[PDB]
Amino acid sequence: SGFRKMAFPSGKVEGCMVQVTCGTTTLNGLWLDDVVYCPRHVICTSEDMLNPNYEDLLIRKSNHNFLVQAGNVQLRVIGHSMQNCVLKLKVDTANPKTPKYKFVRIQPGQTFSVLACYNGSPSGVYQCAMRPNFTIKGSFLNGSCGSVGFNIDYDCVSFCYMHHMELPTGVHAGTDLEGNFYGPFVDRQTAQAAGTDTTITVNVLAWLYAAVINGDRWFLNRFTTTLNDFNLVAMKYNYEPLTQDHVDILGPLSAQTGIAVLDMCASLKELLQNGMNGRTILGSALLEDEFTPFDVVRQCSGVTFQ
């Protein structure tokens, strides 16, 4: 038993992490087969960072301008191209540690592991959710750009996130691995801001099921509610609407615990209207919304990855 914010083992990604330096900018790149992926703003310098034109900036670059460092081995760049907001640096060497992988784009509400890197070297790993407003509450300092977010699905790494920037509230924005930003953000210094977030309702319910599985039961009740009546409460407390599909996805957890999904909604309602009254749930005094139903099933049943 126990329930922890658990990241995927990072080894497969660690072997793909490289250093990319161009001009005065050093960031991280992702080396898969003979391509290194990195944020395109590496080709910028200070004055370039207000209103850049990256097509103009890229045509002025040379392969030899890109210093790519895989540990203590320099990788010769032999081609480069821009794909949206990522740069694809073709290098003369395929990464022998390339795992099976996919580039996937995730939905707000879904979670992933971030391997925070500096200078191509992994610093730490942690779990994140894509917020409804397409930001992530990460932990990122200067030089962390190009760190990736990912899931692992048996032996296959699904890369979903590459880090580009921090917003004024201290949250983080980036792209999928095809270079397309999550949310309405651009890789420029503008006055852009996150915009209002909501709590991921289905995830909160998943975490309540994790709590029941782990022996926290105090918030349970005999009450029930309709899906419509629950969503009128969710709206007031700035929770995402719960769909019938969310109810279906919570089925297995409902079955294991014997608590109907709509019954757990009634519990959530009471927690929203009354608070926790000094109690905790799974060591939290807040309703936690960064575990998906899958995350709960994964942890509470012991799925591994080969």
Ligand X SMILES: *[C@H](O)[C@H](C[C@@H]1CCNC1=O)NC(=O)[C@@H]1[C@H]2CCC[C@H]2CN1C(=O)COc1ccc(Cl)c(Cl)c1
Residue ranges binding ligand X (CB under 6 A): 27, 41, 49, 140-145, 164-166, 172, 187-189
Q: Which of 106, 287, 105, 113 is nearest to 200 (CA)?
A: 287
Q: For residue 124, what is the enclosing H or E element?
A: strand 121-129
Structural tokens at position 273: 């209207």
Residue closer to its own copies, measured from CB, 97 or 105: 97
Q: Give Cβ neighbours of residue 243 (< 8 Å, ≥ 6 apart).
A: none
Q: Which among ligand X, its own copies, none contacts residue 41 (Cβ within 5 to 8 A by kind)?
A: ligand X
Catalytic-role residue among 41, 163, 164, 246: 41
Binding site for its own copies (CB under 8 A): 1-12, 14-15, 71, 115-119, 121-126, 128, 137-144, 166, 170-172, 214-215, 280, 283-286, 298-306
- In whole angstroms, the minimum distance from the beta carbon of 126 to its own copies comes to 4
Contact status, residue 165 vs residue 154, Cβ threshold 8 Å: no
- In whole angstroms, the minimum distance from the beta carbon of 11 to its own copies comes to 3
Q: Which among its own copies, ligand X, none contacts residue 119 (Cβ within 5 to 8 A by kind)?
A: its own copies
Residue closer to ligand X, measured from CB, 141 or 191: 141
- In whole angstroms, the minimum distance from the beta carbon of 56 to its own copies comes to 31
Known catalytic residue at 41: yes
Cα distance between residue 222 and residue 263, in whole Å: 7
- In whole angstroms, the minimum distance from the beta carbon of 149 to its own copies comes to 12
How do beta strands 121-129 and 111-118 pair?
Answer: antiparallel
The conformation of residue 239, written as its DSSP 8-state character, comes to B
User: How many CA atoms within 13 Å lie on the side-chain side of 251?
Assistant: 5
Residue closer to ligand X, measured from CB, 108 or 146: 146
Structural tokens at position 177: 């691995």
Buried b (16+ CB within 10 A) or exposed e, 178-211: ebebbbebebeeeeeebeebbbbbbbbbbbbbbb
Contact status, residue 217 vs residue 267, Cβ threshold 8 Å: no
- In whole angstroms, the minimum distance from the beta carbon of 105 to its own copies comes to 22
Q: Which among its own copies, ligand X, none contacts residue 164 (Cβ within 5 to 8 A by kind)?
A: ligand X
Catalytic-role residue among 145, 160, 163, 164: 145
Residue closer to ligand X, measured from CB, 161 or 230: 161
Q: Which among its own copies, ligand X, none contacts residue 105 (Cβ within 5 to 8 A by kind)?
A: none
Cα distance between residue 306 and residue 223, in whole Å: 43
Residue closer to its own copies, measured from CB, 90 or 298: 298
Known catalytic residue at 163: no
Catalytic residues: 41, 145
